[PDB]
Design a protein around this ligand. Structure first.
Ligand SMILES: Nc1ncnc2c1ncn2[C@@H]1O[C@H](COP(=O)(O)OP(=O)(O)O)[C@@H](O)[C@H]1O
Ligand SMILES: Nc1ncnc2c1ncn2[C@@H]1O[C@H](COP(=O)(O)OP(=O)(O)O)[C@@H](O)[C@H]1O
Ligand SMILES: Cc1cn([C@H]2C[C@H](O)[C@@H](COP(=O)(O)O)O2)c(=O)[nH]c1=O
Ligand SMILES: Cc1cn([C@H]2C[C@H](O)[C@@H](COP(=O)(O)O)O2)c(=O)[nH]c1=O
Ligand code: NA
Ligand code: NA
Ligand code: NA
Ligand code: NA
Ligand code: NA
Ligand code: NA
Lengths: 211, 211
């Protein structure tokens, strides 16, 4: 009752290759939720505004160079420093719609940096687990013509090919919903809405990666 | 031969409670090695001068506050960004004498922050393993009168008591050498020298935590 510590909002993550449409789709979903009287906050990773995120942003823009393990652990620490906020929102009944999470961490590091997958998962163990992940599936060559593509470190077609394969580490999980993202914006969004309307709305216990 | 990738220097770590004499002893050992014609570099963790180390230094000085997991992972990332340097030194035949390493990470986080020990070890898995660790053993109340004690976050006797117990996670390992550090500087140093002279001097393969 008073000490109720149940998760009341839902936590939805978008995952996908670079420029696959995650910001596009997460903003449309947020607007749809607001229109159906659901309180919701839009979050994303990496958050480049924190001290850790600033270092990350320099890495992505090739303004610095860092060893594979060092940058992998910063991407994870950047999520941890948001756990208090995500937990509080969800306890309040506010939904969280989030562009990228720990699945990006594992897929990008194991595919682009060739880090060991179990080693990559470890530091994200214990993060709050989302209700669903929409994976905006595009082939590795598909998005190379969209606006700023090639500006940041992983945006080369040969790297995207590797990350496309390591995203399959999650492809058969029950929380993972493959979405064909080589379609019109509105078609993709309608599929996402269809899936979101099946989410069961009741307060429940928090769960944690990698359960 | 030409592609020889053998570890040629030795890697010695000092561990110990706050103000237990690690900088004192590591400088004396460095001077002793130089006097016996051994090339050596003195390193220490956290390195507060990097981008990551700056954030760490603010945490230790209570200039910011951070969640337990976030700061734990930064302490680990701070070691990783030194692996290229430590590896190169050791390949060259330069010894590395280092004030604190991954054992501090595990002992401080599991003792002061109550983090799960296996979770704390994971991100340091894969770091280069030292030849020996001297643990400058002092009781948890012992150092409270030494110069700047109480300036930084963990320097309260009740926290030191907890970290004293979690340093025992390594107490029975073959690389771990307990040194009674409640003695005169010169007596402690003579014990360390005695142990250092038993190290076998030949080139060998690198080993890695937590083997
Ligand atoms: N399905 C789509 N069809 C055409 N253009 C799209 C589609 N989805 C997104 N875009 C455009 O592609 C670019 C990248 O989209 P964005 O949502 O920013 O990708 P991400 O967040 O995955 O990097 C933007 O210019 C966006 O307007
Ligand atoms: N064995 C000792 N006896 C008396 N004073 C010592 C001894 N070892 C170190 N000190 C003094 O204690 C303080 C902390 O020593 P330091 O080597 O800086 O500790 P740490 O590096 O472990 O924090 C310094 O003022 C140092 O001169
Ligand atoms: C969240 C996360 C993102 N990334 C990559 C995915 C993108 O290439 C870049 C983030 O940029 P974005 O989401 O604008 O594309 O960071 C990681 O490598 N590890 C992570 O943990
Ligand atoms: C290297 C390391 C140090 N620490 C603590 C030990 C000290 O209290 C502080 C470092 O300060 P120092 O070595 O001057 O004392 O950081 C950690 O908590 N985790 C680590 O991984
Ligand atoms: Na990108
Ligand atoms: Na985005
Ligand atoms: Na699925
Ligand atoms: Na200290
Ligand atoms: Na020191
Ligand atoms: Na021993």
């Amino acid at each position: 009752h008073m000490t109720d510590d149940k998760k009341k909002g839902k936590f939805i993550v978008f995952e996908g290759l670079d420029r696959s449409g995650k910001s596009t789709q997460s903003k449309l979903l947020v607007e749809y939720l607001k229109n159906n009287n659901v309180e919701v906050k839009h979050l994303y990773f990496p958050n480049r505004e924190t001290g850790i995120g600033q270092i990350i942003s320099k890495y992505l823009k090739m303004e610095n160079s860092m060893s594979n393990e060092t940058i992998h652990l910063l991407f994870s620490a950047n999520r941890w420093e948001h756990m208090n906020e995500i937990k509080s929102l969800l306890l309040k009944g506010i939904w969280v719609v989030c562009d990228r999470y720990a699945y990006s961490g594992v897929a990008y590091s194991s595919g682009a940096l060739n880090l060991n997958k179990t080693w990559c998962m470890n530091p994200d163990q214990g993060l709050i687990k989302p209700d669903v992940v929409f994976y905006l599936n595009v082939p590795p060559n598909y998005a190379q013509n969209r606006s700023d593509y090639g500006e940041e470190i992983y945006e080369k077609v040969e790297t995207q090919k590797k990350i496309y394969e390591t995203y399959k580490h999650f492809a058969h999980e029950d929380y993972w919903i493959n979405i064909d993202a080589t379609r019109k914006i509105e078609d993709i969004h309608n599929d996402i809405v269809k899936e979101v309307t099946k989410i069961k709305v009741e307060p429940e216990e928090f769960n944690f990666l990698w359960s």
